[PDB]
């Protein structure tokens, strides 16, 4: 689970502006935090198929959002994935 402080820090860091809470860039940043933590869990917990179910959802959610961003603008898309460290 994700703390409100880490959540709000993600919001502030990826916001387009101070009241943006839901742009696709903020959404993929939130999902990237979740995917990173859950990958570390599943590397240690291969039999946690319940948690693995969540990963496949989260990876798909981010895949759809990044594909949406990429055809709004490749400049914003490339900058965003570079910040998040996604190849």
């Amino acid at each position: 689970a994700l703390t409100q402080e880490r959540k709000q820090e993600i919001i502030v860091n990826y916001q387009v502006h101070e009241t943006d809470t839901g742009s696709a860039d903020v959404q993929v940043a939130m999902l990237t935090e979740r995917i990173n933590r859950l990958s570390l869990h599943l590397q240690a917990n291969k039999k946690d198929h319940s948690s693995r179910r969540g990963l496949l959802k989260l990876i798909g959610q981010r895949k759809r959002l990044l594909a949406y961003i990429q055809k709004d603008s490749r400049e914003k898309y490339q900058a965003l994935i570079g910040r998040l460290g996604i190849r």
Binding site: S39, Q43, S50, R52, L55, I59, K63, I86
Partner: protein
């Protein structure tokens, strides 16, 4: 069916178990995986599928350069040989499956072409129905194997009248019929064949044998990829998911010892039977078995000692032990795998080799087969093969002095027919065939006797355990179980009851039905009905008769047939195959199954 398996736990100190586990998991199973990969890429692979046969030596040839590859080099000679046998039998299995499926697809595709309605047969013959009926009466009078003979007659007879007459004659089960064709029952029967062709076509898209990766390196690298990389499209992400859901293989492939003397038996000073394997004699394993099997493991030592005392003038061709499989059974709980899992030896024996009379049966079977071989076989190593065969043929004459038990004698005119059904798994009729009289019926309830309550237990547990799995799946709970072992128990109880009744009436044989593939018949029948009832509504079609289709997929007619065949062979009762009639009750089906198998003796 005189080959059976007996098993024992193998016990040894930890360093022996660890050394064997590492040989199996780190070298032998990776070698098997590599052989499966290379064999599936071989340029002759596509012609092996057409022959349905693997070359006798191609796995051995592929393994030779791998025996000194740093990935695989550390193994005894018999472990390489075991890996070869594993891989060779896998493809012998898979190529045989694909070959038969292809023949089924070709056979039914021809039938779909020659299945024409009388409205179509009128046009395609150009003759009135009475005219083709007469021509079918002539062609039947010549073809008098009848089915195959008509299928032979069809192909090269390009004369559309005779060709249509054969089509009409085959539509009716190789016979004349006066009655009119019900056009909707024909259209349904045509549709069944299309579904069967489609389902055969889909089954022929089987995967190549997948192997056992025990490291699961592909899973972890895919996890790192899918979490840090953008998927190029949906199909890459789907392939990632398909890998991430794939479950890890825990256990290596077992070892196979096709030379019975590669298991060397001994008794330790604490009096326990012990075994070691060729190439691993430093690892002594202690035999821990039930007394109900101990007499076999004692026999393995006595057979070994007999041939040593005779300075190898006996043949191991008559050793009661045939081969061994060395298996790790999955342990519950946690530990290092050589501690967690339990090492188990499975020995094939031929039950006839227990007695002296049965050994004489095997000796003649061996002698005839080897005398045939030596005559037909006639290089230096091929001449050495002849000399080994001639040594076997000489040495099988030396007796092991085994227990004498006179062979079963059954009356040729007394048969037991066993009717198999979805509702009543077995029903038997003892028939005196020259008298044409039933000596005894038994129902399923009389066969099970006091065990009959197990049959309602099975139905009740199959319902209950399916529903508990359904509930557990939604929670991702691992606690998913089923009644397969109870079902196996019931089929073995029935098999013993049937054979005991056969012995009691001195039946010469047990008659079993040629059911064919009941599941593909039922599945294509129900689909053809459902497509009429739910046109354009696939989920309605799949809901239709769902529980009947499930019941037919659970019907264990093969396991019951196999259990009967094994028990009859262990008492020397002949098994015969007959055709079960569709008419009548299970009792009448069993009687007419028995009597038809008697009349089919030619």
């Amino acid at each position: 069916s005189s080959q059976i398996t007996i098993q024992a736990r193998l016990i040894s100190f930890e360093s022996n178990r660890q050394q064997l586990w590492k040989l199996m998991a780190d070298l032998n199973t990776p070698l098997i995986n590599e052989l499966l990969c290379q064999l599936g890429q071989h340029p002759d692979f596509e012609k092996w599928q057409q022959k349905g046969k693997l070359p006798s030596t191609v796995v051995s040839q592929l393994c030779q350069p791998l025996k000194t590859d740093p990935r695989f080099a550390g193994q005894p000679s018999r472990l390489y040989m075991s890996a070869i046998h594993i891989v060779d039998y896998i493809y012998k299995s898979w190529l045989a499956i694909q070959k038969r499926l292809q023949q089924q697809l070709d056979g039914k595709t021809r039938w779909l072409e020659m299945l024409n309605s009388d409205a179509e047969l009128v046009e395609l013959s150009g003759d009135t129905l009475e005219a083709i009926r007469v021509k079918a009466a002539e062609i039947l009078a010549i073809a008098m194997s009848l089915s195959k003979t008509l299928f032979d007659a069809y192909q090269e007879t390009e004369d559309i009248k005779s060709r249509s007459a054969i089509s009409y004659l085959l539509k009716n089960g190789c016979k004349l019929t006066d009655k009119e064709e019900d056009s909707e029952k024909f259209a349904k029967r045509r549709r069944q064949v299309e579904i069967q062709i489609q389902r055969l076509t889909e089954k022929l898209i089987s995967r190549m044998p997948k192997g056992r990766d025990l490291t699961n390196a592909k899973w972890l690298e895919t996890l790192l990829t899918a979490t840090t990389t953008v998927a190029e499209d949906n199909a890459q992400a789907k392939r990632w998911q398909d890998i991430l859901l794939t479950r890890s293989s825990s256990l290596p492939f077992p070892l196979v010892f096709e030379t019975n003397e590669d298991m060397v038996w001994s008794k330790n000073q604490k009096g326990r039977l012990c075994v070691h394997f060729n190439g691993l004699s430093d690892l002594i394993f202690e035999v821990y078995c039930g007394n109900r099997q101990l007499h076999w493991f004692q026999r393995f030592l006595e057979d070994q000692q007999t041939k040593r005392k005779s300075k190898n003038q006996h043949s191991s061709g008559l050793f009661t032990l045939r081969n061994g499989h060395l298996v790790w059974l999955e342990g519950e709980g946690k530990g290092e795998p050589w501690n967690l899992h339990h090492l188990t030896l499975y020995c094939c024996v031929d039950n006839r080799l227990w007695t002296e009379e049965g050994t004489e049966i095997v000796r003649q079977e061996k002698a005839d087969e080897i005398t045939k071989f030596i005559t037909n076989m006639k290089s230096d190593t091929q001449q050495a093969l002849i000399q080994r065969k001639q040594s076997t043929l000489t040495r099988i004459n030396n007796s092991f002095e085994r227990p004498s038990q006179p062979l079963y004698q059954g009356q040729s005119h007394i048969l037991v027919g066993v009717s198999l059904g979805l509702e009543k798994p077995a029903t038997v009729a003892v028939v005196d065939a020259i008298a044409n009289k039933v000596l005894a019926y038994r129902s399923i309830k009389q066969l099970l006797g006091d065990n009959y309550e197990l049959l309602n237990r099975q139905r009740r547990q199959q319902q209950y355990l399916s529903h508990e799995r359904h509930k557990a799946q939604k929670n991702f709970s691992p606690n998913q179980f089923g009644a397969s072992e109870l079902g196996q128990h019931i089929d073995r109880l029935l098999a013993k009851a049937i054979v005991a009744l056969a012995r009691t009436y001195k039946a010469g044989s047990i008659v079993l039905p040629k059911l064919g593939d009941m599941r593909e018949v039922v599945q294509s029948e129900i689909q053809a009905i459902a497509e009429q009832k739910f046109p354009g509504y696939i989920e309605g079609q799949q809901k239709y008769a769902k529980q009947y289709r499930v019941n037919v997929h659970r019907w264990s007619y093969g396991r019951l047939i196999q259990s009967i065949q094994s028990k009859a062979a262990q008492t020397g009762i002949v098994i015969e195959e007959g055709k079960q009639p569709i008419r009548g009750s299970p009792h009448d089906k069993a009687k007419e199954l028995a009597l038809s198998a008697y009349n089919l003796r030619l």
